[PDB]
Scaffold this motif. Structure first.
Motif, short mmCIF file in Angstrom:
data_model
loop_
_atom_site.label_atom_id
_atom_site.label_comp_id
_atom_site.label_asym_id
_atom_site.label_seq_id
_atom_site.Cartn_x
_atom_site.Cartn_y
_atom_site.Cartn_z
N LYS A 143 1.46 10.96 31.51
CA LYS A 143 1.68 11.64 32.79
C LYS A 143 0.82 12.89 32.90
CE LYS A 143 4.94 14.85 32.69
NZ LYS A 143 6.20 15.41 33.26
N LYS A 169 -6.51 -5.33 28.50
CA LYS A 169 -6.62 -6.66 29.09
C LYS A 169 -6.85 -6.59 30.59
CE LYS A 169 -2.67 -7.62 27.28
NZ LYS A 169 -2.79 -6.26 26.68
N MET A 170 -6.13 -5.71 31.29
CA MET A 170 -6.21 -5.61 32.74
C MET A 170 -7.19 -4.55 33.22
SD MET A 170 -2.51 -6.59 34.10
CE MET A 170 -1.21 -7.34 33.12
N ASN A 226 -6.22 2.07 -1.37
CA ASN A 226 -7.10 1.74 -0.26
C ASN A 226 -6.86 2.62 0.97
OD1 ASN A 226 -8.18 -0.30 -1.82
ND2 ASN A 226 -6.88 -1.90 -0.92
N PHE A 227 -6.35 3.84 0.78
CA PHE A 227 -5.99 4.72 1.89
C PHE A 227 -7.10 4.85 2.93
CE2 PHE A 227 -3.05 6.42 -1.39
CZ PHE A 227 -1.88 6.19 -0.70
N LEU A 228 -6.71 4.97 4.20
CA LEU A 228 -7.62 5.15 5.32
C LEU A 228 -7.45 6.55 5.88
CD1 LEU A 228 -7.16 1.76 7.25
CD2 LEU A 228 -9.07 2.40 5.78
N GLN A 288 3.59 22.66 16.39
CA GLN A 288 3.46 23.09 17.78
C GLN A 288 3.13 24.57 17.82
OE1 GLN A 288 7.31 21.71 19.05
NE2 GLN A 288 6.45 20.05 20.30
N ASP A 337 -8.38 -2.90 10.70
CA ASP A 337 -9.23 -1.73 10.56
C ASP A 337 -10.54 -2.13 9.88
OD1 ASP A 337 -6.70 -1.08 11.30
OD2 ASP A 337 -6.29 0.28 9.63
N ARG A 338 -11.38 -1.14 9.55
CA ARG A 338 -12.62 -1.43 8.85
C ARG A 338 -12.35 -2.04 7.48
NH1 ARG A 338 -16.15 4.16 10.02
NH2 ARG A 338 -15.99 4.05 12.30
N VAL A 339 -11.40 -1.48 6.73
CA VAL A 339 -11.11 -1.97 5.39
C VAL A 339 -10.41 -3.32 5.44
CG1 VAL A 339 -9.94 -1.42 3.23
CG2 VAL A 339 -10.98 0.41 4.57
N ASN A 340 -9.46 -3.48 6.36
CA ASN A 340 -8.62 -4.67 6.41
C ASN A 340 -9.11 -5.63 7.49
OD1 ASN A 340 -6.73 -2.99 4.71
ND2 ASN A 340 -6.47 -1.96 6.69
N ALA A 350 -10.16 8.57 11.30
CA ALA A 350 -11.24 7.84 11.93
C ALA A 350 -11.26 6.37 11.54
CB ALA A 350 -12.58 8.48 11.59
N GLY A 351 -10.48 5.97 10.54
CA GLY A 351 -10.49 4.60 10.07
C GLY A 351 -11.54 4.29 9.04
N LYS A 363 -1.27 -1.08 12.70
CA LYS A 363 -2.47 -1.43 13.44
C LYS A 363 -3.35 -2.38 12.64
CE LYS A 363 -6.78 0.75 14.99
NZ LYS A 363 -7.32 2.08 15.37
N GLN A 407 0.85 -1.18 0.00
CA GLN A 407 0.00 0.00 0.00
C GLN A 407 0.89 1.24 0.00
OE1 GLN A 407 -3.43 -1.28 0.37
NE2 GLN A 407 -2.29 -3.22 0.33
N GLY A 408 0.30 2.40 0.29
CA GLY A 408 1.06 3.62 0.42
C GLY A 408 1.08 4.18 1.83
N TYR A 409 0.36 3.52 2.74
CA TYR A 409 0.22 3.98 4.11
C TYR A 409 0.62 2.88 5.08
CZ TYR A 409 -4.10 1.27 4.44
OH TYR A 409 -5.02 0.25 4.45
N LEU A 422 -13.03 4.54 5.11
CA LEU A 422 -12.50 4.65 3.75
C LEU A 422 -12.73 6.05 3.20
CD1 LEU A 422 -10.94 2.95 1.82
CD2 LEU A 422 -13.07 1.91 1.02
#
Lengths: 703, 296, 720
Positions: free
Chosen positions: B240, B284-285, B121-123, B221, A594-597, B126-127, A588, A582-584, B129
């Motif tokens: 922190k 998990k914990m 297929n870039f994301l 920044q 993710d939704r796509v993968n 927010a995840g 994760k 891919q390009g990204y 498409l």
């Protein structure tokens, strides 16, 4: 200095001088005197070639071609072209200027004293094959031909150089002004008689003296020689290209399947899957190893007070009584009160490790005279079949236990996206392999080797008792101080670092060696006592083994912590490949999805002869275990086998991608690979796994 | 409100808060201002070079836009699958590089579609498409040589001020088709816009003017020590700092927490601060931690 | 579930899967022993591949010499060292024609650099074989010893400072009838030492003068000693090889085929660019093939005579003196003599004895007493053996000493690009041991015909391609110097990783060196962000362990940790404290090139800033980037023996042992009661006895008579 350079000359001149002098392949900063000299020379030659011009017949109204400043390659080719077109000899030194009228190359120079001597020595250097004009800061000029330069050019150059000389002394720069001859002091190089004879006798067959070789090289035209030599060469000199095919590949080292050969022994320094740590919960303070061992034995007092050993197995040569008495002495020293961890009953320690059986060195003359002193044949490694315990080692070391032994420091806050990606990868990696048994075994290994190396600081002629301890942490947060056994290190009178210092190690375990008799042909094992975990009695054996390692081996064990970085780099390469598809970034997604993968799954191993898949975490754990085993079981055989299996694997990959690979001498590669499969457990198991995977690929490529 | 600044995110926030913003369509770093012509939107399938089919709403009709991106100005002519003519001015090289690449992507020229080789297929953050147009935009922004090579060149016009440009914005006779430079700089007033759930600006008639994907990802920044009060966003800071903030919040209102705890209900473990703090707790914990804390 | 790690290859391309197989780029400790046997085997193999050449007797060193150049061409695929001069000259001609004005410019630049260089440059090198003592010594010590010997022999090249006079004096020293020099000789010991008898035996060195005949020095200078380098060369060769390698590097830098001296991502760029260039000009409808070739016995087949021919051809238009200077190195190598090392070891099990046979006495015993392999090796090596425990070795290159020239020769081989005007064009890359070959043709048959022609051509030049370690595949995937390229993706086979422990200079210096090492590893070897961050973590852990500077808020206990904890308690800007002071580490990828002092300056306590950066603090007193503060201390570096003459003559007198014995009782009765600080030991004894008498009288151990007697004796001492 540099300020004067950038103020007294135009930016173009400074840049030209800098880029022409940087070709010397040296730092241009610490030595700027030659930079000033070259800048002045460039200015002088630029001025010399800006007033006189020629025409179709040679009217004086250009005549001077500038060679300096331009790239050395372009300058040299231009000079050669000019010499060829004008039918004149080419000077051996790159001339800084050429004249169209005289049809001769010329050189210029700048000095501080009288120019007559400089001109004469330059003439001696170049003979009479090049003309020259020279000017000096103290108003002196010298010309080989009086019809070269006119009054205007000489006057302007003189004024410029006089102004530079006057200005230099204003800022205390004339004092540090280096001359010009220094950069060319060495121009005389005469060979002596001996070196000339050596050169003469070092020519290819067919020449008598090096003069003949030099003339042959400088005169003969060898065009077409390659074709003539190749035409008569025998046809037998052929690579013999052969297109590779799936059926061509065959299992490597089938002898490992020969049941006649013995099983591969367990030659690792420390028990990895069979370890048994005498847990002793502690607040978290740091204490000397002797005190930790004393407390751990106090907690398990029954094992410490064991005096009657129930021998279970014995090595072929080692003596059980001597080892047991040495272990008793070690525990007595551990349980005493003196701060030092030094053995005081050197008797059994000396007589148990065979330290008194070493041969005595005698003078070479006696050996030459003696007839019974003969060189001994090399004990080539034996040949062994597949060992079933390596599979269990790999299986168990990749499991997740209830304790972790990794506590790394912190890093600064992450800001850049690359830092965030790296931090996420680190988080996933550590979370996956924090509790893996391989990590604890690696920490025990590195800590023990570090302690062994430290003990060799000042104690070299004395026996030292060292407990095989470890600091571990569990999920609940309470931390334990485990003791895996003891080890007494002998003396190394020789100061060499590659000299073996015998150490005998007694490690606790809970596995009865009788189950796998072939796994321990080199260990002497007793039975000390029995522990209770859930109200159930489990026996405890003490594997006692003699071993020999040198200081460099201690350093290797200490560096064995690099398996963490190795595994992380392998995982990062996998992730980088996935992201390059891919390009990204794919971190994760390939870990959690993710939704796509979808969560990426890797083929881990075999279950009842069928392929089995698993999460990326399992793949990471297997990678870490493989790296740790590679480091632990490392010998020349292993590295050679890996280096050749590299080529075999690359060819298999080329076959997979339908790239139509071709092999010239396949059997040569196979012999090179099989030359290393002799007795290493890791090499033999790697060969077995490679055969299995090759079979799987063959059977799966037909679809 | 005081400063007429910001590029996209400021406009989105202003609309969410109901403020005055400038009227101009945006396609990322490229902001558009239609001057003439109109077009319709039709949804249909198209084939890309890599060989995948995905529905797109293409705009058909003669359109003239006042394309701009950063500092460089220009005008764009757009029709069905064709980039008729494009004119640009002089500025920093990367400026018109981005301007022209975004112009290709927005013109929906068939050559741009054929200029895709790898997967797109870039994301998003927010995840979810990305829209196909923004997917191509991002791919070509990361991959400029491919589209430039695929587009094809032509001869530059003979006008004095009009000259071509190469891939690296070098003046040359071979110029990208329909792309020219011009020294006749074109010259560069507020309204109200509504907002929807997905942080997309929609004009009075309903056309989308600025989406949530046009926000430049250029992290930086701030030159001033900005402060925030809401705990929902404390997660942005380090662990922190999050712990310090949540414990300060707990301590300052400790009286209310004690009063509610003495009642024995369960509404006091769901404060926004606790939701922000939960993020740094391992998944998990987390359950065991909460159970033990509640029990104690 | 039996794990099978190789199954990973099913789900991952092998190029990525086997990434970083070997954590170490150096040498393991378990490599097959490189002793006398290994060097004997190396010389045997070097002479074996060239045994069909001309064998003669050197008239200078009186050693057997083998010259395979212009020898019969091979009739078998076995390695061959017979490189025809005509083919090499034609290849150089083709390279020069393709790159006009390249050889001339490179030679000019090399000669200018040589003119401007200095002898000190020779000190930048690994262990060098010192001939005065005939051992392996550091470069600086070897250079100093050679200079001293030259001065003793009326040779003062180093005085002028230039390298040209130094090499002129070297070649002149090769002509003196008798060479006198300094050497170190060890003599046993008889001085006292308290173990159980106040007497110990050791070895003390002394400097002596020794002279050697002309032939002995000639043989010694050409000797190559052995310590994956197999041998090291003395100082008489270093300057000439340096100049020749500089010339070869100048030529290579402008050769697109050369894979050196590229380092870092530039290597990846070169690889991808070469692949793209070859694919671009592929014939329409043709096929492009790639060979990941390897060379067997690379340095055991290249001949120094061929290197001499290459140097002569390159510097065809250059001053004669520079031509001779360049030629001095190949001729020295063509006469190299190998040293076989320590020797063998023979044992007798029945009598439990062992002994070491040194190289000169290698053949002093019947060959039947050596094992089979050593027996055969000595039988084969007998003709090429000298009575002084050295082996004549004309051919070969004993690993890397002309790596740049080797790359130039490989590029010349790759530059032919065609034989017989057939339908194939070849090119590629080569870096001094390994070559990647790309061939474009119509069909794979013609590509393999071209590969065969290239194999024959390189055979003619003496380069032997490895058929047992080479393969061919459609272009797009290959390897080049442990760097796998696959359709754009690139991976490394072996990557050096940071070693355990600090650099070993000081707190700030060690931190800076560690961070810059991590940065360089990222830039050059291609270490990913996560790996670099983990390396930072490991380095911080090791640093804290070594310097006992754990976090100020930690619960660890130590001598320094109490003050660290107090400082942490008293400090307000806890983010500004340095790691060495138990502060928090803040290093990450974006700030791996900034000293921690500069990083934390804005957060430091002003009082802490003043204390740390005090302009006059007693620690600092009088590459990497750091800040000069109180953490730049210096450790005591003073050991060995000085005042050698006075100490040696004192210890050789007699009564030293009695003085030590008298000193021991009094000054060991107490742990430390010595008025040290240059006090004469007699003065310290006088004071000690005065105090002892005073205490004895005060406690009553002695009566007034003994008191007065003691004070009178002490009065004679002079300190009372």
């Amino acid at each position: 200095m540099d300020t004067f350079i950038t103020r007294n000359f135009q930016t173009t001149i400074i840049q030209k001088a800098k880029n022409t002098m940087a070709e010397f392949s040296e730092d241009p900063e610490l030595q700027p005197a030659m930079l000033f000299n070259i800048c002045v020379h460039l200015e002088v030659c630029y001025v010399i070639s800006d007033m006189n011009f020629l025409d179709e017949e040679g009217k004086a109204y250009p005549q001077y071609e500038v060679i300096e400043g331009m790239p050395r390659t372009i300058a040299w080719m231009v000079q050669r072209s000019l010499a060829q077109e004008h039918g004149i000899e080419t000077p051996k030194y790159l001339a800084d200027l050429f004249d169209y009228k005289t049809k001769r190359f010329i050189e210029v120079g700048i000095t501080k004293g009288l120019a007559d001597d400089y001109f004469w020595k330059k003439k001696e250097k170049l003979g009479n094959s090049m003309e020259l004009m020279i000017f000096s800061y103290n108003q002196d000029y010298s010309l080989s031909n009086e019809s070269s330069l006119d009054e205007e050019g000489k006057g302007r150059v003189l004024s410029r150089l006089t102004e530079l000389q006057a200005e230099l002394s204003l800022k205390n720069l004339w004092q540090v002004l280096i001359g010009e001859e220094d950069v060319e002091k060495g121009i005389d190089f005469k060979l002596g008689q001996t070196i000339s004879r050596l050169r003469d006798i070092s020519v290819p067959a067919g020449f008598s003296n090096f003069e003949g070789m030099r003339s042959y090289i400088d005169n003969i035209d060898p065009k077409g020689a390659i074709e003539r030599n190749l035409a008569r060469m025998s046809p037998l000199v052929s690579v013999t290209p052969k297109k590779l095919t799936w059926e061509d590949l065959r299992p490597i080292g089938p002898h490992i399947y020969n049941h006649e050969l013995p099983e591969v022994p367990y030659n690792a320094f420390l028990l990895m899957s069979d370890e048994l740590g005498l847990a002793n919960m502690t607040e978290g303070k740091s204490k000397k190893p002797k005190t930790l061992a004393k407390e751990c034995l106090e907690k398990y007092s029954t094992l410490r007070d064991q005096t009657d050993p129930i021998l279970i197995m014995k090595s072929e040569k080692a003596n059980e009584n001597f080892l047991w008495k040495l272990w008793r002495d070690c525990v007595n020293t551990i349980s005493n009160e003196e701060m030092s961890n030094e053995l005081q009953k050197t008797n059994y320690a000396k007589w148990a490790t065979g330290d008194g059986l070493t041969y005595q060195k005698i003078m070479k003359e006696v050996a030459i005279d003696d007839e019974t002193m003969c060189q001994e044949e090399p004990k080539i490694p034996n040949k062994c079949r597949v060992a079933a315990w390596v599979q269990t080692e790999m299986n168990l070391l990749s499991t997740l236990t209830s304790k972790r032994a990794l506590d790394l420091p912190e890093i600064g806050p992450d800001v850049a996206p690359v830092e965030h990606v790296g931090s996420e990868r680190r988080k996933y990696f550590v979370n996956e392999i924090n509790y893996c048994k391989a990590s604890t075994v690696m920490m025990k290994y590195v800590l023990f080797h570090t302690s062994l190396l430290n003990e060799s600081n000042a104690s070299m002629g004395k026996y030292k008792v060292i407990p095989i301890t470890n600091r571990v942490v569990n999920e609940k947060g309470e931390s334990f101080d485990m003791l895996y056994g003891l080890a007494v290190k002998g003396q190394s009178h020789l100061r060499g670092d590659t000299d073996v210092v015998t150490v005998v190690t007694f490690e606790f375990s809970s596995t009865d060696p009788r189950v796998d008799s072939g796994k321990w042909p080199k260990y002497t094992v007793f039975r000390i006592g029995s522990l209770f975990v859930s109200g159930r009695e489990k026996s405890v054996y003490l594997y006692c083994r003699v071993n020999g390692t040198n200081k460099i081996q201690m350093k290797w064990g200490m560096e064995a912590r690099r398996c963490l970085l190795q595994s992380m780099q392998q995982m990062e390469a996998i992730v980088e490949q996935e992201s390059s598809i891919q390009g990204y970034d794919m971190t994760k997604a390939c870990f959690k999805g993710d939704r796509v993968n979808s969560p990426k799954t890797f083929s881990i191993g075999t279950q009842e002869g069928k392929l089995v898949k698993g999460s990326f975490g399992k793949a990471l754990r297997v990678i870490f275990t493989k790296c740790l085993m590679h480091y632990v079981f490392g010998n020349a055989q292993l590295e050679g086998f890996s280096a050749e299996s590299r080529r075999l694997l690359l060819l298999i990959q080329a076959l997979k991608d339908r790239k139509g690979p071709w092999v010239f001498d396949l059997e040569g590669m196979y012999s090179g690979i099989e030359e290393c499969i002799s007795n290493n457990p890791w090499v033999i198991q790697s060969a077995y796994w490679f055969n299995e995977w090759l079979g799987f690929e063959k059977e799966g490529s037909k679809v | 409100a005081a400063i007429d600044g910001g590029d996209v995110a400021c406009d989105i926030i202003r609309a969410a808060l109901g403020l005055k913003i400038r009227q101009r369509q945006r396609f990322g770093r490229l902001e558009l201002k239609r001057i003439s012509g109109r077009g319709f939107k039709n949804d249909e399938e198209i084939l890309i070079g890599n060989g995948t089919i995905q529905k797109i709403g293409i705009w058909d009709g003669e359109e003239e836009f006042h394309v701009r991106c950063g500092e460089c100005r220009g005008i764009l002519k757009k029709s069905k699958m064709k980039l008729e003519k494009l004119l640009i001015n002089s500025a920093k090289k990367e400026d018109m590089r981005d301007l022209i690449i975004l112009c290709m992507v927005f013109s929906q020229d068939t050559r741009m579609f054929q200029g895709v080789r790898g997967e797109i297929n870039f994301l998003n953050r927010a995840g979810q498409l990305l829209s196909p147009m923004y997917q191509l935009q991002r791919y070509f922004l990361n991959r400029s040589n491919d589209l430039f090579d695929q587009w094809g060149y032509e001869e530059s016009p003979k006008a004095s001020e009009l000259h071509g440009i190469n891939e690296s914005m070098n003046a040359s006779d071979y110029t990208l088709k329909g792309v020219v430079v011009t020294r006749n700089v074109i010259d560069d007033e507020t309204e109200k816009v509504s907002i929807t759930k997905n942080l997309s600006l929609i004009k009075r008639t309903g056309e989308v003017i600025m989406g949530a994907n046009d926000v430049s990802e250029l992290e930086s920044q701030a030159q001033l020590m900005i402060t925030y009060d809401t705990p929902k966003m404390w997660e942005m800071g380090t662990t922190k700092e999050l712990v310090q903030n949540t414990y300060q919040w707990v301590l300052k209102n400790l009286v209310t927490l004690k009063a509610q705890f003495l009642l024995g209900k369960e509404d006091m473990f769901q404060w926004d601060a606790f939701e922000a703090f939960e993020s740094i707790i391992p998944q998990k914990m987390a359950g065991q931690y909460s159970g033990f804390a509640r029990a104690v | 579930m039996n794990i099978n790690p190789y199954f990973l290859f099913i789900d991952v391309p092998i190029q990525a899967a086997i990434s970083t197989t070997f954590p170490y780029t150096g040498v393991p400790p378990y490599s097959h022993g490189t002793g006398t046997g290994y060097t004997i085997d190396t010389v045997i193999r070097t002479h074996e591949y060239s045994n069909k050449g001309k064998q003669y007797i050197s008239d200078v060193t009186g050693c057997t010499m083998v010259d395979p150049t212009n020898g019969p061409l091979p009739e078998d695929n076995e390695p061959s060292a017979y490189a025809q001069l005509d083919c090499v000259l034609e290849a150089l001609d083709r390279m020069d024609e393709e790159h006009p004005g390249l050889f001339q410019a490179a030679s000019q630049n090399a000669m200018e650099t040589l003119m401007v260089t200095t002898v000190d440059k020779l000190t930048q090198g690994r262990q060098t074989f010192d001939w005065t003592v005939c051992r392996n010594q550091p470069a600086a010590t070897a250079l100093n010893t050679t200079i001293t010997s030259f001065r003793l022999n009326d040779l003062n090249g180093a005085d002028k400072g230039g390298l040209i006079p130094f090499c002129q004096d070297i070649i002149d020293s090769l002509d003196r009838p008798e060479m006198t020099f300094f050497s170190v000789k060890n003599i046993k010991k008889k001085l006292p030492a308290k173990n159980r008898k106040g007497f110990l035996i050791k070895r003390i060195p002394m400097k002596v003068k020794d002279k050697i005949t002309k032939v002995e020095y000639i043989k010694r200078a050409l000797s190559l000693n052995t310590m994956r380098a197999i041998a090291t060369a003395g100082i008489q060769i270093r300057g000439f090889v340096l100049v020749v390698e500089n010339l070869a590097k100048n030529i290579c830098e402008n050769l697109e085929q050369s894979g050196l001296p590229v380092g870092g991502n530039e290597k990846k760029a070169k690889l991808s660019n070469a692949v793209a260039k070859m694919l671009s000009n592929c014939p329409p409808g043709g096929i492009s093939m790639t060979v990941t070739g390897d060379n067997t016995k690379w340095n055991e087949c290249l001949n120094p005579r061929i290197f001499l021919a290459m140097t002569e051809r390159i510097t065809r238009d250059s001053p004669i003196w520079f031509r001779d200077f360049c030629s001095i190195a190949p001729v020295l190598f063509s006469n190299k003599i190998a040293r076989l090392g320590k020797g063998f070891m023979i044992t007798s099990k029945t009598k439990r004895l062992k002994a070491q046979i040194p190289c000169p006495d290698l053949f002093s015993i019947p060959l039947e007493r050596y094992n089979e392999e050593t027996r055969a090796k000595l039988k084969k090596l007998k003709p090429f053996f000298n009575e002084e425990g050295t082996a004549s070795l004309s051919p070969g290159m004993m690993m890397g000493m002309f790596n740049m020239l080797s790359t130039v020769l490989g590029v010349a081989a790759l530059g032919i690009k065609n034989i017989g005007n057939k339908e194939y064009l070849w090119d590629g890359l080569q870096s001094s041991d390994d070559f990647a070959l790309f061939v474009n043709a119509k069909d794979e048959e013609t590509c393999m015909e071209g590969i065969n022609d290239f194999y024959r051509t390189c055979k003619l030049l003496g380069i032997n391609m490895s058929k047992k370690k080479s393969y061919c595949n459609e272009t797009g995937m290959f390897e080049f110097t442990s760097m796998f390229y696959r359709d754009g993706f690139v991976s490394n086979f072996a990557m050096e990783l940071p070693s355990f422990g600090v650099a070993g200079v000081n707190e700030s210096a060690d931190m800076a060196i560690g961070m810059t090492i991590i940065k360089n590893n990222m830039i050059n070897n291609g270490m990913g962000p996560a790996t670099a961050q983990t390396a930072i973590q490991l380095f911080i852990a090791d640093y804290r362990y070594t310097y006992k500077c754990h976090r100020g808020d930690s619960k660890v206990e130590g001598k320094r940790m109490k003050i660290i904890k107090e400082l942490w308690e008293n400090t307000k800007g806890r983010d500004g404290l340095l790691v060495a002071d138990g502060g928090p580490n803040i290093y990450n990828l974006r700030n791996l090139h900034i000293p921690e002092i500069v990083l934390k300056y804005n957060l430091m306590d002003p009082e802490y800033k003043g204390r740390l950066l005090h302009p006059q603090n007693p620690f600092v007193g009088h590459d990497y980037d750091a800040v000069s503060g109180t953490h730049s201390w210096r450790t005591k570096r003073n050991r060995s023996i000085l005042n050698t003459d006075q100490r040696n003559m004192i210890l050789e007198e007699q009564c030293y042992a009695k003085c030590c014995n008298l000193f021991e009782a009094c000054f060991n009765s107490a742990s430390y009661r010595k008025p040290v600080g240059q006090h004469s030991m007699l003065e310290a004894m006088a004071h000690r006895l005065r105090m002892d008498a005073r205490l004895d009288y005060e406690s009553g151990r002695m009566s007034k008579d003994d008191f007065e007697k003691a004070m009178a004796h002490l009065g004679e001492i002079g300190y009372i």
